[PDB]
Amino acid sequence: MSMLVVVTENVPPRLRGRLAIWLLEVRAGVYVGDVSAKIREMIWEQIAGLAEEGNVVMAWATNTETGFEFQTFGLNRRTPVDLDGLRLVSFLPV
């Protein structure tokens, strides 16, 4: 069981509700909670399914070099980038 963070943008109210069933919406589209690996991989199924043409990123705590991992869904100006195993995010200009 490790910390979980979900940030959603331009997502239908359907998913925005679903995430509020397990996680805590501290800010607009920002959900924070502490779940397990099995539950986390279930939260992603909810995101991949209920989110249409909207961008969502989910970051969870691990024992990696960064101390955490993150995966994205949909397109956005801020896309993740691989730097020799290290994942960062880049800002795309138009």
Binding site: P13, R14, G17, A20, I21, L24, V35
Partner: protein, 253 residues
């Protein structure tokens, strides 16, 4: 997409809702109050939700809470349990298992003696019937209540004890249901709708829950209800109660 309940141990223990209307906005638990402020409650994150007077639940609210596997408890004065709602039942084999044990006095005695053995650590005297054991049980409980009065210095408070135990009864019933057993079919306690709840809870009741009630009761603090709840909350967290409940029921049987 379908929504299923997460394991009980991987959840918070209890939350207390006291005023406002409980509705379902965009598919999520919310608590709207008199001034119109909304509050979302992570229901699939909570093992059990206590509903105090002044709350008005909607139909969808009870429906949502059942699917996510959260027990709803309508609570009275000083946190006493009034009513409860949960999924319309749960697993047959686990239920028949409990049943057969209770239908046979020989097996029932085995279960009760184990409860005794777990509650006090020492085996019960041999050739003592269930009726006889309960008499002994009362004596030990009566004495334990008296001791706590001397250890913490109290005058033999009841509001604190009832509130603390009520919290334990909440998660205990939530555990029995999530496990797939029936809270009505007890072994030591019988005839009551929460017989099995009282059986399991009484075993670990005097470990930390009841003496803590005396600790809070030792002083004379404002709003004893809050003082007890956050205390019980820490107990369930520190002593990892929720994780220990499911194996305990199975261990007893």
């Amino acid at each position: 997409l379908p929504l299923n309940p997460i394991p009980l141990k991987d959840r918070v223990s209890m939350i207390f809702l006291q005023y406002g209307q409980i509705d379902v906005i965009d598919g999520a638990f919310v608590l709207i109050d008199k001034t119109g402020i909304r509050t979302h409650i992570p229901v699939g994150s909570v093992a059990c939700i206590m509903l105090e007077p002044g709350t008005r639940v909607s139909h969808a609210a009870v429906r949502l809470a059942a699917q996510v596997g959260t027990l709803l408890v309508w609570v009275g004065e000083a946190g006493v349990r009034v009513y409860a709602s949960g999924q319309p039942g749960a697993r047959s084999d686990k239920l028949l298992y409990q049943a057969k044990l209770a239908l046979d006095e020989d097996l029932r005695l085995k279960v009760v003696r184990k409860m005794f053995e777990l509650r006090f650590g020492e085996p019960a005297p041999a050739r003592r019937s269930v009726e006889q054991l309960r008499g002994i049980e009362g004596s030990r409980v009566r004495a334990t209540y008296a001791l706590l009065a001397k250890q913490y210095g109290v005058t033999w408070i009841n509001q604190c004890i009832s509130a603390a135990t009520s919290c334990l009864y909440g998660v205990t019933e939530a555990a029995i249901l999530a496990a797939g057993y029936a809270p009505a079919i007890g072994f030591v306690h019988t005839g009551k709708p929460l017989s099995f709840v009282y059986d399991i809870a009484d075993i670990i009741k005097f470990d930390t829950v009841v003496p803590k009630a005396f600790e809070i009761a030792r002083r004379n603090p404002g709003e004893p209800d809050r003082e007890v709840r956050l205390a019980c909350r820490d107990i369930f967290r520190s002593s990892k109660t929720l994780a220990k409940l499911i194996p305990l029921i199975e261990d007893v049987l």
